[PDB]
Design a protein around this ligand. Structure first.
Ligand SMILES: Nc1ccnc(-c2ccccc2)c1
Lengths: 367, 367
């Protein structure tokens, strides 16, 4: 008999790493062709984004299946650990096979490989469940559609950590100035190179800040949750999938815009991405409020002490993004500045969210 | 009052991601120049490896400092969460600053940036501890040099997951055949492209298998540990640092060798890397046996039921790597085949480790 907490955490980390692979090309796509070749570049970017979304959804489905399989198996063992490692190895091939299918649909080989991989995952799961059943003491006490809070929390943390640090990873990978390049192009001055590369640092700053605040809201929301239903899991997975686009949005926004209208469009895209990312969390919290009796703790129940605080925490980002999106069309002159100042305002509001909520209560109550 | 388990897990994931950044160039270095330019390529690879080791050690030190800081702080809050996010953001800049220092030592700016970043991390930690002290109820109950098992386990799992899936990440990133390339170069046949790219798949297979078995041994060892001392933490960090070289070793080994002696040298390098990775785990287990009374559970005590099983689990890899390294010089003709068959033999022994240990006991007892 062995505890499965560490094993399940490792499996969640592996699944989170695998799910977030196809984002890497998307962030590595050239910023601007500079030769007004927008057509092909946009088509390639759209295809990559669609492929990434599809693989993320498929890996999420596989992760949910694994979570259920190990939920019906209470305990673990060395043989079960080896079988879990094998299952993770088989699952890891899904993104590459899906990409091979998508880019080369005409050939009948990619679909064959995908079917083989799915059948292999099924076989590993069948072997795991059979081994567990052959030994009754390794099964769950009850047996021997709620989800598990720990698995969802670990997957969300892994996804958020991967998304937040992507830009810094790329910067460390490729944004190290070369000696002779600095000597010749920039008159042998490092400060010039740092100034040139600053926009990437600003984009990383913004992306990391936004992702960190979103993760903080996610953690605050999930702390006060007792039971996680399948609908909440689906909404959380959708929110995580839409979160992966934040680095791309910030890279596009921070990049120099040829014309002001291009900057307005980039800000609109970033605002839409943020709104989509946060509205799913809001919707999942409403789905939890639907039956707090079986979902939330008494503290965050209707009329609770922290009910309004949680409302504000989960509505700060959606509402602000909506106002920014509206201003992008209402004023159309300070929209870029509005987004820039909002990027610094939202963290301040989150830090002072308690005092701001108290002031809002004081002013609305006697208004 | 809020629980810090999720927050500490997220911090550990971020720190593990940051620590394992500089490995990415190392695995992305060109396999063979093909123009007998071994000098410059080898110098660049050695410099990259040294930089990676240094950054990993520095990030490990920072992670240990953070672990102590949050150990003296029992509970967390929204303000503490924001401060932790800020501290992680400041820490994330360490690898890039260290690289800037190393590549450009002559200029006095990289050292200034590194000092500024270290001072910033110190300032964030000071602010965190001051805020915690200002509110007594947020401090640890005892206050209001053992380590934490959970933090070490999470960091190890993150590092292992990152290392294992690096090769598949690269394959998905860059190893997707192009339509016209297949049409023209390979006579429009996808099977030819897959056969050409197979060596990378084999290298990923080997690396993932080895890393997974090493992680399984790590989990089995750490399950039976009550208290983790600083020496065990240092040994585990050294083992993790040396584990990061496995993908590079497997990439070099699977790559076509110009001459047989090159293949022998590559196998020697891979065997040495594996031996270094596993000997540190063995040494840390011996350091735990030093005072099992305060370190291990009674089950794995001297003369315990699982003592010999754990001995075999932790000595299978070191001993086998030592025999392979010896054979690389003794026979010098089947060394490559010896390594290839060992790669498949070791997982089988691990799977049947219980039965193999029983047979070994039966044969040694009455021998
Ligand atoms: N996608 C990742 C990358 C690195 N680490 C993790 C992780 C680590 C510990 C617990 C949960 C998740 C996830």
């Amino acid at each position: 008999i062995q505890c499965s907490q560490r094993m399940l955490s490792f499996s969640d980390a592996l699944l989170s790493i695998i799910a977030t692979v196809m984002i890497l090309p998307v962030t590595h796509t050239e910023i601007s062709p500079e030769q007004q070749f927008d057509r092909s570049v946009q088509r390639l970017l759209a295809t990559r984004i669609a492929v990434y979304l599809m693989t993320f959804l498929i890996v999420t489905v596989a992760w949910a299946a694994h979570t259920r399989l190990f939920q019906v198996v209470g305990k673990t063992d060395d043989t079960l650990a080896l079988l879990n490692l094998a299952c993770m190895m088989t699952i890891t091939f899904l993104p590459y096979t899906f990409s091979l299918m998508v880019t080369f649909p005409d050939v009948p080989l990619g679909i064959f490989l995908f079917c083989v991989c799915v059948i292999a995952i099924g076989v590993v799961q069948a072997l795991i469940v059979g081994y567990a059943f052959h030994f009754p003491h390794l099964l769950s006490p009850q047996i021997q559609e709620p989800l598990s809070k720990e698995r969802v929390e670990a997957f969300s943390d892994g996804v958020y950590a991967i998304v937040a640090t992507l830009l810094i990873l790329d910067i460390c990978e490729d944004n190290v100035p070369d000696p002779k390049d600095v000597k010749e192009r920039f008159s042998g001055s490092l400060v010039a190179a740092l100034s040139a590369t600053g926009p990437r640092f600003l984009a990383y700053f913004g992306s990391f800040a936004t992702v960190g605040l979103l993760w903080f809201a996610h953690h605050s929301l999930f702390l006060h949750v007792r039971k996680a239903t399948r609908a909440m899991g689906l909404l959380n997975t959708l929110s995580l999938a839409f979160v992966g686009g934040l680095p791309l949005a910030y890279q596009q926004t921070s990049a120099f815009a040829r014309q002001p209208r291009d900057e307005l469009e980039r800000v609109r895209v970033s605002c839409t991405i943020i709104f989509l990312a946060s509205i799913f969390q809001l919707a999942m919290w409403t789905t939890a409020l639907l039956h707090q009796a079986e979902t939330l703790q008494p503290s965050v129940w209707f009329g609770g002490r922290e009910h309004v605080l949680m409302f504000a925490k989960l509505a700060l980002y959606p509402c602000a993004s909506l106002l920014a999106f509206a201003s992008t069309c209402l004023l159309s002159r300070f929209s870029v500045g509005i987004f820039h100042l909002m990027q610094i305002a939202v963290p301040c509001a989150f830090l002072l969210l308690r005092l701001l909520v108290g002031l809002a209560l004081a002013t609305l109550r006697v208004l």
